[PDB]
């Protein structure tokens, strides 16, 4: 028996395109974007953070019928001009790009001078809601690094403290935000075998980013970014099948 019969195909109903591709949830989305029907012209901005396996991206999205409007965005690859040439997928990189998205959004709205956020690391501000994006919200996930970046940048993104590294550890949070975990990984690898360390943090070395230099370069990056943000048709199809069968007459 074959379950792929034409009756099966005829009765089959497809999922939404984005669900089919796995990109979106459509259950989280429809609760992120659904706003109280009492309130008119309230957009309910969502802070969308998506991490690729090379870099992470943050943006501010406003839901609209014709499609989402992106009010601000930030990519990890933009940290090169801010002084971070490597580790753009890091927890620290996620914090930095969340900071970048927040600062750029505030600048575009012309409210930097009025919402300074915080300094260093530990009227009502703009409210945005964190968009997960399929990833599992485990403790110490990079989406919450991006959320902390935006919160320090001045956005009011509601959040709990459970999923920062440590179920609360502000010291551990600051260490991961400043990349201390990467630094201690460098130290452990160096002290245990040099070859694996060199082959692992290769372009770290090629950029001569020492383990002790990571925290300072991330702080400098933070202050700098804070201060400046071909088809075929039926005719030739029939022609090609005709010639195909003409050759197939004697081919096999």
């Amino acid at each position: 028996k074959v379950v792929k019969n034409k009756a099966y195909f005829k009765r089959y109903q497809v999922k939404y395109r984005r669900r089919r591709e796995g990109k979106t949830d459509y259950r989280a989305r429809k609760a992120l974007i659904l706003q109280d029907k009492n309130k008119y012209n309230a957009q309910k901005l969502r802070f969308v953070v998506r991490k690729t396996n090379s870099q992470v991206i943050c943006q501010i999205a406003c839901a609209h019928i014709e499609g989402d409007k992106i009010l601000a965005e930030a990519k990890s690859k933009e940290l090169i001009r801010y002084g971070i040439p490597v580790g753009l997928k890091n927890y620290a990189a996620a914090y930095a790009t969340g900071l970048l998205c927040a600062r750029r959004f505030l600048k575009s709205l012309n409210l930097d001078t009025q919402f300074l956020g915080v300094e260093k690391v530990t009227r009502k501000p703009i409210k945005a809601f964190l968009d997960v994006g399929i990833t599992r919200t485990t403790t110490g996930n990079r989406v919450f690094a991006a959320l902390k970046g935006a919160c320090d940048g001045g956005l009011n993104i509601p959040h709990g403290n459970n999923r920062f590294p440590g179920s609360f550890n502000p010291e551990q949070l600051r260490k991961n935000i400043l990349g201390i975990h990467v630094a201690e990984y460098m130290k452990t690898l160096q002290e245990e075998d040099n070859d694996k360390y060199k082959t692992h943090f290769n372009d770290y070395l090629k950029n001569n980013i020492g383990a002790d230099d990571i925290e300072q370069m991330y702080l400098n990056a933070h202050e700098k970014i804070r201060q400046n943000p071909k088809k075929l048709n039926a005719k030739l199809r029939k022609k090609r099948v005709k010639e195909k069968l003409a050759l197939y007459v004697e081919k096999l």
Binding site: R11, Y12, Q13, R27, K30, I33, L34, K37
Partner: protein
């Protein structure tokens, strides 16, 4: 002997072929205001806030809006009189009614016509035309196009 809430809704409250599944995310973005007309179509995928059997497919103007619900005022025929009924449903079971769209477009177009007509000092008929009898026409047709028709024999 059976008059439950959903009695006799075997087909009315069933999803269309290959159209199952929850409501689209974009439907939650629909804009609703007080006093505008709205259609009541029951979405079986959402159970809470479901309208009664009778009001499926009816139309009425919104008289109340809540966080996730709409109270819409619907005429119901009861024996010798119509009476107003306030039905409270959720968002998924309500949709913007196109019962007014021709009127709204007519209002806009007629306004921008009346403005120019008054500007040029012209008298125009703004009412709809209810077109009837066509005028005499003087039509030409090739002789090779006229074909003779006669009733066919039986077979």
């Amino acid at each position: 002997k059976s008059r439950g809430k959903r009695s006799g809704t075997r087909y009315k409250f069933s999803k269309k072929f290959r159209k199952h599944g929850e409501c689209t995310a974009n439907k939650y973005l629909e804009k609703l205001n007080y006093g505008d007309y709205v259609d009541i179509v029951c979405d079986s995928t959402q159970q809470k806030g479901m309208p009664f059997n009778y009001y499926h497919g009816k139309t009425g103007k919104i008289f109340h809006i809540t966080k996730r619900g709409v109270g819409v005022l619907v005429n119901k025929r009861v024996k010798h009189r119509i009476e107003q009924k306030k039905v409270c449903v959720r968002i998924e079971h309500v949709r913007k009614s196109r019962c007014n769209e021709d009127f709204l477009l007519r209002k806009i177009k007629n306004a921008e016509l009346i403005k120019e007509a008054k500007l040029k000092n012209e008298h125009i008929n703004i009412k709809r035309k209810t077109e009837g009898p066509k005028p005499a026409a003087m039509i030409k047709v090739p002789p090779s196009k006229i074909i003779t028709i006669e009733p066919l024999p039986f077979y």
